[PDB]
């Protein structure tokens, strides 16, 4: 059929792609440079989609095919087509190459591909077993070049079990895997393992253990930008739930900055929602461009209403906002922070008063913030002066809030500190760029 | 260019759509007279359904029959041109059919007919005229995508080849759309460019064009350009001599007569509320004009008591205090209020300090870009 | 014609006189300058405000007590303007490198 | 030096954004005149940074 022949052609092109990736893996192991395995994994997400039964059937018929347990393991889980007319024997290894065992990296890549296909087919149980087998056989291996594919397979195994709605049978095993990766000095594998452990804790609400792990473990600096963004989001949630609001805001802004341009909509949605909540708690009204964006508009609409209520200062509006979308906030895992905002709303008003006025009288500030009595205003203002929200100094002798006089920052040292940080970053970037330089062997 | 579609009809429809003026009588009579004279049956039905009016059975049937027989005559002429006359005759017949389709208010049919005429039209000038007709239709209906695509097409046609008159008309059309989209800077630029040789009398008379130009220029242009291009502009001054209110409003800001400026600004807000193009942006225009006036007053002062500025603006101390606090909270005015002593102190950054802030911001952006590039390439 | 041109001449004369009378002072109070020019306090205040707002003689008024402070208007430090322009140029060069590096 | 480096950065922008691929290896050899790309480039960066660093260290 026309559709069938088109599918066969796409399968053949995918087979050519996998052959190219396996050749790259072999060249990487020969040259001991991750670059090639990194590119193979980079192409992996694209190949994850656009795969049917015959695709992987032909891949297993051509690759491997040594009568090994893999063929008797995945094939019983994946159907087999009839005698295809275009029986092109996809055999990159010919004669001696076929006899030689498949390279550990290449075999791991093929097992990862089959596991991804099982994921996309919702064969949760079969992917379970195939992932255990591949993980066990990769655990024995100790080649450095295998570590990146090991990290990818680790992440996909955690994902398969996450769809298994258990995500606890993995806790100890991923802890052990991450610890071994840390011992081995691996970077990508330990990065993915730490991110996945943090994700599991955040799912099951074990915040304290996650904070302990983040405090003790150290994330390698030379990690993937996407992995860094995921870790930043997880650490931002940990900090925000733990009352380190400023650090949470900074970390989540960094995570948003490091997001993959336009590749992951959902991660951006969640980061924006949590950042909006944290910023509202910290006393800053968030930017409207986020709410106006096309992809994030409908997702953040309840947060837009919440920000409206907070800025306007109408506690009743906040209550009706919670009534309509309270369950949505809960399902988003931000209900507790929203309640904290409900009881901290006065911080935004105090911050606005601090920005506007410089010597506001206590009675007038109490009137403006709809407080009942001036003494409550004094209490709230002092609490704000600690909370990093205001920089004033109450003069209780005459009861007026005297904001600190602004000073010429340039004549002070802060510009030197900012320039030092930026110059250090620039010099480090230059050193890193000239450091690799990928000079070929003559 | 042809007056069809008549933007006055769209303005009247919007005015009736406004809550207060929904029951207006004179606008009702004007719109009904326009519909009857122009015989807009589809437009009449759409307006009746939208405004919940009582459809006149006799008038509606008469208009429908007139539209039907006119369309039949146009189709007969098109068939005659197709059979006997050449390509030019058929193109003109289809152009007339599309023109009458726009006459009655059939948006979809008129647009499709104009598209067919454009497809069958070879002359560049006629293609530009078709684009102008579609742009006028879009303005009448406020179809953002249609107006944007057709403006791009008209720009491409002019770039390939185009007379100066078409360029001026397209400049005025872009200015009107920009005013309707709230990009007041481009509106001011285009309108100030075209005010000298305003030849697009179909969209709006010259007095309305000068009023719009003054409004958008004051919302966009700064004081030096405002003086050089609006205050001393011969055309704008000549037109304003016939519009005392607009002249007073414009001169209040430049001459520093703030109470009269606020009176004129209230009048202008009321006028724009009814206007069909400035209606969505009237609140923003008034807010930005007030912010501009406050900043202009504060530019020459470092610490002015709230009482003095309240007297200057002809408003109470409490109102000016509240408005100044609101505008400071949004980071628009560079001042900090001192309620106990009632003194407003301007905190305008020194040139060195502002330059340091700008360099910090731009360098942070560039460093983020460089870090992303290094991460992407280093693998 | 006479009215408009004489009003403009009056404006020019007031500007010149005010500039002449503020040259020695640095923090002159508005009342003294008005007395020196023999004009109403409000008129001199308005003219000074307009002059400052129009990049005329440099200074800032303070209605809290009333003075016409005059300073020397630091130049601008052209070095920072050049640095900002170079930063913009390098940002667009980084954009170009973004256009490159697509070929891996 | 900063103004001349701004002009040189404009020139470097023009040279790089062009990135003419009509045998780029030949382009880099047909425009060799000790000009914008790096010669009048980071040479000036080194001059500026050496002078500024030495002056600041001496001042401290």
């Amino acid at each position: 059929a026309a559709a069938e022949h088109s599918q066969r052609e796409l399968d053949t092109v995918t087979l050519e792609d996998i052959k190219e990736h396996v050749k790259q893996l072999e060249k990487a192991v020969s040259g001991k440079e991750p670059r090639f395995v990194l590119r193979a994994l980079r192409m992996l997400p694209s190949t994850s989609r656009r795969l049917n039964h015959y695709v992987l059937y032909k891949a297993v018929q051509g690759f491997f095919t040594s009568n090994n347990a893999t063929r008797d393991f995945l094939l019983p889980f994946l159907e087999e087509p009839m005698d295809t007319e275009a029986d092109l024997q996809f055999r990159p290894r010919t004669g001696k190459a076929a006899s030689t065992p498949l390279l550990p990296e290449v075999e791991a890549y093929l097992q990862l591909l089959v596991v991804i296909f099982m994921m996309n087919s919702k064969r949760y149980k079969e992917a379970q077993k195939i992932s255990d087998d591949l993980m066990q056989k990769i655990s024995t291996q100790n080649r450095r070049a295998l570590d990146l594919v090991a990290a990818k397979c680790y992440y996909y195994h955690a994902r398969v079990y996450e769809f298994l709605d258990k995500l606890d049978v993995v806790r100890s095993f991923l802890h052990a895997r991450l610890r071994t990766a840390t011992l081995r000095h691996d970077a990508d594998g330990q990065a993915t393992l730490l991110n996945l452990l943090l994700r599991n804790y955040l799912h099951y609400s074990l915040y304290d253990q996650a904070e302990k792990l983040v405090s003790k473990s150290v994330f390698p600096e030379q990690a993937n930008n996407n992995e860094w963004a995921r870790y930043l989001y997880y650490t931002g949630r940990i900090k925000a739930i733990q009352l380190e609001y400023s650090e949470a805001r900074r970390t989540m802004t960094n995570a948003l900055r490091k997001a993959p341009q336009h590749t992951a909509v959902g991660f951006k949605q969640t980061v924006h929602k949590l950042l909006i909540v944290v910023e509202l708690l910290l006393g800053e009204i968030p930017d409207r461009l986020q709410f106006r964006q096309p992809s994030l508009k409908r997702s953040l609409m309840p947060y837009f209403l919440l920000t409206q209520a907070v800025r306007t200062g109408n506690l009743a509006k906040f209550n009706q906002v919670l009534d309509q979308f309270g369950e949505k906030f809960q399902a988003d895992g931000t209900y507790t922070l929203i309640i904290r905002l409900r009881h901290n709303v006065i911080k935004t008003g105090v911050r606005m008063i601090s920005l506007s006025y410089s010597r506001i009288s206590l009675a007038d500030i109490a009137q403006k913030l709809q407080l009942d009595s001036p003494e409550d205003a004094e209490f709230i203002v002092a609490k704000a002066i600690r909370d990093g929200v205001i920089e004033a100094s109450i003069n209780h002798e005459k009861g007026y809030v005297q904001s600190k006089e602004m000073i010429d920052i340039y004549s002070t040292r802060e510009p030197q500190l900012a320039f030092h940080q930026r110059i250090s970053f620039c010099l480090d970037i230059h050193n890193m760029s000239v450091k690799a330089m990928r000079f070929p062997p003559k | 260019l042809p007056k069809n579609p008549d933007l006055r009809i769209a303005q009247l429809r919007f005015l009736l759509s406004l809550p207060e003026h929904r029951g207006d009588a004179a606008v009702r009579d004007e719109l009904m007279a326009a519909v009857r004279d122009n015989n807009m049956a589809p437009y009449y039905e759409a307006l009746c359904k939208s405004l919940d009016w009582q459809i006149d059975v006799d008038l509606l049937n008469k208009m429908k029959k007139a539209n039907e027989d006119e369309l039949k005559r146009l189709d007969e002429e098109l068939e005659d041109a197709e059979k006997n006359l050449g390509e030019s005759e058929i193109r003109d017949a289809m152009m007339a059919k599309a023109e009458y389709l726009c006459r009655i208010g059939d948006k979809e049919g008129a647009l499709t007919a104009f598209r067919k005429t454009y497809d069958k039209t070879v002359a560049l000038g006629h293609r530009l005229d078709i684009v102008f007709y579609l742009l006028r239709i879009g303005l009448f209906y406020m179809d953002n995508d249609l107006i944007t695509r057709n403006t791009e097409k008209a720009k491409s046609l002019i770039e390939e080849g185009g007379d100066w008159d078409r360029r001026n008309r397209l400049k005025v059309y872009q200015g009107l759309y920009c005013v309707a989209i709230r990009d007041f800077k481009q509106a001011a630029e285009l309108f100030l460019d075209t005010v000298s040789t305003f030849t697009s009398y179909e969209l709006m008379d010259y007095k309305t064009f000068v009023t719009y130009t003054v409004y958008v220029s004051m919302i966009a242009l700064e004081r030096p350009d405002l003086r050089e291009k609006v205050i001393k502009g011969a055309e704008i001054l000549e037109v304003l001599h016939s519009l005392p209110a607009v002249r007073q409003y414009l001169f209040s800001l430049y001459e520093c007569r703030y109470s009269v400026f606020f009176q004129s600004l209230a009048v202008v807000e009321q006028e724009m509320k009814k206007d069909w193009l400035f209606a969505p942006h009237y609140r923003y225009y008034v807010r930005e004009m007030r912010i501009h006036a406050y900043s202009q007053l504060l530019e020459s002062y470092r610490s002015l008591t709230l009482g003095y500025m309240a007297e200057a603006f002809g408003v109470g101390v409490e109102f000016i205090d509240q408005e100044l606090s609101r505008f400071i909270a949004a980071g628009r005015l560079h001042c900090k209020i001192d309620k106990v002593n009632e003194i407003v102190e301007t905190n305008r950054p020194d040139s060195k300090n502002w330059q340091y802030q700008e360099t910090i911001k731009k360098g942070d952006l560039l460093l983020n870009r460089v870090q992303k590039l290094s991460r992407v390439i280093n693998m | 014609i006479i009215s408009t041109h004489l009003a403009k001449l009056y404006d020019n004369l007031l500007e010149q006189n005010l500039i002449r009378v503020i040259e020695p002072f640095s923090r002159v109070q508005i009342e003294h300058i008005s007395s020196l020019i023999k004009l109403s306090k409000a008129d001199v205040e308005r003219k000074l405000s307009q002059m400052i707002l129009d990049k005329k003689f440099h200074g800032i008024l303070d209605q809290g007590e009333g003075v016409l402070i005059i300073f020397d208007e630091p130049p601008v430090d052209k070095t920072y303007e050049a640095a900002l322009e170079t930063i913009q140029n390098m940002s667009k060069v980084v954009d170009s490198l973004y256009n490159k590096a697509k070929k891996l | 030096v900063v103004k001349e480096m701004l002009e040189l950065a404009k020139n470097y922008n023009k040279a790089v954004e062009e990135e003419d691929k009509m045998t780029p290896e030949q382009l880099a050899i047909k425009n060799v005149g000790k000009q914008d790309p790096k010669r009048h480039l980071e040479e000036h960066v080194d001059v500026l940074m050496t002078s500024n660093i030495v002056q600041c260290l001496a001042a401290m």
Binding site: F419, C426, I429, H430, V434, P440 | - | - | -
Partner: peptide, 30 residues
């Protein structure tokens, strides 16, 4: 700081050029 930014941009451009040269040589190898 401006000099450091210029140096970093130049180094990144040189790294991009060298990487593209190496990739082109490898591709033309086979």
């Amino acid at each position: 700081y401006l000099a450091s930014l210029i140096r970093s941009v130049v180094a990144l451009h040189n790294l991009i050029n060298n990487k593209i040269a190496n990739r082109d040589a490898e591709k033309k190898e086979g």
